Amino acid sequence: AQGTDGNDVLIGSDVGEQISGGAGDDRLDGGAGDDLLDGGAGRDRLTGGLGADTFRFALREDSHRSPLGTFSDLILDFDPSQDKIDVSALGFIGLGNGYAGTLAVSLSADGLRTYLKSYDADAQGRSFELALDGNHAATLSAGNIVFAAATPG
Numbered sequence: 001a002q003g004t005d006g007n008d009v010l011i012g013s014d015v016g017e018q019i020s021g022g023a024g025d026d027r028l029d030g031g032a033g034d035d036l037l038d039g040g041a042g043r044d045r046l047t048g049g050l051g052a053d054t055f056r057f058a059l060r061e062d063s064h065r066s067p068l069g070t071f072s073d074l075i076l077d078f079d080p081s082q083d084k085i086d087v088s089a090l091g092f093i094g095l096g097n098g099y100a101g102t103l104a105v106s107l108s109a110d111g112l113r114t115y116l117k118s119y120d121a122d123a124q125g126r127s128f129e130l131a132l133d134g135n136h137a138a139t140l141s142a143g144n145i146v147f148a149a150a151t152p153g
């Protein structure tokens, strides 16, 4: 149960579960039930399935990009009416610009993919960025992110 260091392919059952991938490149699948999914070090692909699911960092380096390669995580499909994403351990100095440690959101030309970018360079020049593939951008809501409370204006 759960993953270990190295690459893993993990598939969850119908009941609610807590699943961590550990280090390495992992795929996590949650299935039905409300699930907790920890990506761990390395780039990961997280699939929540039915139920309210929370996707979390386990390390401060859990999702970053560099010229040495991308180590960011991707969440698949995503239910914006129910699911939660926590990014607090990476840290961001702002939520509305997209450069120098401030977040912004971007979309693919067909809206089928969504990206969270920051171009962080606080000291190490390592940008902390995430992506969502297959995302229901058509029904996305600000409630999904840890900061929440983003009223329109």
Ligand SMILES: [Ca+2]
Pocket (backbone or CB within 6 Å): 003, 004, 005, 006, 007, 008, 021, 022, 023, 024, 025, 026
């Ligand atoms: Ca692993």
Ligand SMILES: [Ca+2]
Pocket (backbone or CB within 6 Å): 012, 013, 014, 015, 016, 017, 030, 031, 032, 033, 034, 035
């Ligand atoms: Ca499950």
Ligand SMILES: [Ca+2]
Pocket (backbone or CB within 6 Å): 021, 022, 023, 024, 025, 026, 039, 040, 041, 042, 043, 044
């Ligand atoms: Ca991992």
Ligand SMILES: [Ca+2]
Pocket (backbone or CB within 6 Å): 030, 031, 032, 033, 034, 035, 048, 049, 050, 051, 052, 053
């Ligand atoms: Ca689930």
Ligand SMILES: [Ca+2]
Pocket (backbone or CB within 6 Å): 048, 049, 050, 051, 052, 053, 078, 079, 082, 083
């Ligand atoms: Ca879900």
Ligand SMILES: [Ca+2]
Pocket (backbone or CB within 6 Å): 039, 040, 041, 042, 043, 044, 062, 063, 071, 072, 073
């Ligand atoms: Ca990760």
